[PDB]
Amino acid sequence: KQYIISEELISEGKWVKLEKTTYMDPTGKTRTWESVKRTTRKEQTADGVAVIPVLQRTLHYECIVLVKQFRPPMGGYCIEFPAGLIDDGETPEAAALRELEEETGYKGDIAECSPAVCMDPGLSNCTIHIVTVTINGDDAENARPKPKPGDGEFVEVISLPKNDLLQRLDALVAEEHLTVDARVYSYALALKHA
Amino acid sequence: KQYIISEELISEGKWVKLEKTTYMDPTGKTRTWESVKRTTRKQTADGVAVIPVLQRTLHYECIVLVKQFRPPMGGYCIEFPAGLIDDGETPEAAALRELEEETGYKGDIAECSPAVCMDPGLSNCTIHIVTVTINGDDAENARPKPKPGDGEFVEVISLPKNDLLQRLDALVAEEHLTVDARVYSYALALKHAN
Numbered sequence: 001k002q003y004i005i006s007e008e009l010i011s012e013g014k015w016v017k018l019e020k021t022t023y024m025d026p027t028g029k030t031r032t033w034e035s036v037k038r039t040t041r042k043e044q045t046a047d048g049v050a051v052i053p054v055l056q057r058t059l060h061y062e063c064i065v066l067v068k069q070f071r072p073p074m075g076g077y078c079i080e081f082p083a084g085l086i087d088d089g090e091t092p093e094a095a096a097l098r099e100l101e102e103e104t105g106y107k108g109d110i111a112e113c114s115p116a117v118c119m120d121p122g123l124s125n126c127t128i129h130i131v132t133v134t135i136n137g138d139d140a141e142n143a144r145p146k147p148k149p150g151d152g153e154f155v156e157v158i159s160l161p162k163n164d165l166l167q168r169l170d171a172l173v174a175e176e177h178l179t180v181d182a183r184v185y186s187y188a189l190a191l192k193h194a
Numbered sequence: 195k196q197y198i199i200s201e202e203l204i205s206e207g208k209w210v211k212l213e214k215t216t217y218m219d220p221t222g223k224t225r226t227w228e229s230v231k232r233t234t235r236k237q238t239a240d241g242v243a244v245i246p247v248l249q250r251t252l253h254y255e256c257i258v259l260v261k262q263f264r265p266p267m268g269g270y271c272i273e274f275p276a277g278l279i280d281d282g283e284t285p286e287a288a289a290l291r292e293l294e295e296e297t298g299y300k301g302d303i304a305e306c307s308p309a310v311c312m313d314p315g316l317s318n319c320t321i322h323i324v325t326v327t328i329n330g331d332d333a334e335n336a337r338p339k340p341k342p343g344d345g346e347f348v349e350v351i352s353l354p355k356n357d358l359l360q361r362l363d364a365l366v367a368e369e370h371l372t373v374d375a376r377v378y379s380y381a382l383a384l385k386h387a388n
């Protein structure tokens with residue numbers, strides 16, 4: 001029923017643009033929308049990846065490896081799955097393993113890779129693949145993992161037990177001003193509700 | 195140790211603006227970020243998203259989702275019922291109201307998250323994730339009456355909680371739809387649990 005009629009640039013930055021979207025509503029009437037897009041998306045199947053990294057080690061409870069970074073759009077520190085944009089010509093799997101190593105030091109193994117999923121579809125066209133990766137924490141490669149942050153990346157690694165994820169996030173949010181990411185919170189909620 | 199120095203308006207629509215954020219990196223170097231914000235926040239958060247657990251006896255529990263044309267995406271998305279919180283509305287009340295407008299179901303609050311971020315590398319947008327149960331055997335939910343506001347066009351899709359991820363993959367495979375990242379994250383953790 002509905003479709004895009006036109007997309008008019010309002011303002012293009014170096015990384016993000018705002019567009020005026022004209023579309024057809026399902027009563028055959030024309031409406032507009034204000035749309036955000038990134039300027040960085042080429043032929044990638046999505047803008048980015050987020051990595052669900054399951055750290056597995058003998059005689060440990062499985063942990064979910066999270067990162068804490070300052071996020072200038074938020075004006076504050078945020079707790080998130082490891083994530084980054086997919087480089088031109090890079091596969092979502094390659095992006096995920098690379099980002100995970102850059103941000104956490106860990107060398108993972110791919111488990112699964114989602115289709116492109118929308119970040120905030122009432123606002124932007126931004127998409128990611130959500131990639132599940134297991135980390136063999138008994139491998140010597142992963143013994144004392146050192147992050148390799150790129151320029152202007154400053155990331156702290158926080159591993160929390162899967163079996164208590166939501167409570168452990170609640171405890172961190174209680175102890176300081178930080179925001180938990182909605183996908184991390186959603187995943188912790190489902191772990192509770194299962 | 196990181197913080198915002200200043201924000202420069204780049205461009206301001208009715209619903210969204212783009213800003214150039216200056217911030218101090220943790221070495222003491224000054225850096226810029228292109229940040230998106232909504233103009234509508236006044237509020238605990240911009241929005242709510244509702245995780246609606248439809249409970250009917252002798253049936254699988256379902257998670258109730260919505261499918262809607264999203265102009266930023268140029269296509270149809272599957273998402274948790276959701277909307278912006280009205281000035282003076284609580285996150286709980288926004289949840290029950292949006293759930294009702296979009297699905298016609300009347301539900302009870304189970305739990306309510308703190309403000310969580312939607313896309314913190316790009317925007318300051320936040321929501322409250324509100325878990326709501328719906329007593330599907332109650333007369334008020336027998337023939338659920340969706341009350342959409344102006345310009346909303348919402349299809350209701352209820353999926354069993356126990357096979358959520360496989361059911362969503364099927365919809366994507368059959369229907370050229372984009373699943374929301376929070377929905378997909380919750381679906382993932384249902385499978386990953388235990």
Ligand SMILES: Cc1nsc(N2CCO[C@@H](C)[C@H]2C)n1
Pocket residue numbers: 032033034035122123209210344345346
């Ligand atoms: C980002 C953006 N562009 S238009 C918009 N809306 C505000 C909420 O109500 C919708 C019917 C529509 C007018 N939000």
Ligand SMILES: Cc1nsc(N2CCO[C@@H](C)[C@H]2C)n1
Pocket residue numbers: 015016151152226227228229315316
């Ligand atoms: C939206 C937006 N504004 S600046 C940005 N960048 C994303 C890549 O990492 C940083 C080095 C930074 C320059 N993304």
Ligand SMILES: [Cl-]
Pocket residue numbers: 193247304325327
């Ligand atoms: Cl529940």
Ligand SMILES: [Mg+2]
Pocket residue numbers: 082083084103
């Ligand atoms: Mg990153």
Ligand SMILES: [Mg+2]
Pocket residue numbers: 083084099102103153
């Ligand atoms: Mg990175």
Ligand SMILES: [Mg+2]
Pocket residue numbers: 275276277292296
């Ligand atoms: Mg809505």
Ligand SMILES: [Mg+2]
Pocket residue numbers: 276277292295296342343346
């Ligand atoms: Mg609504």
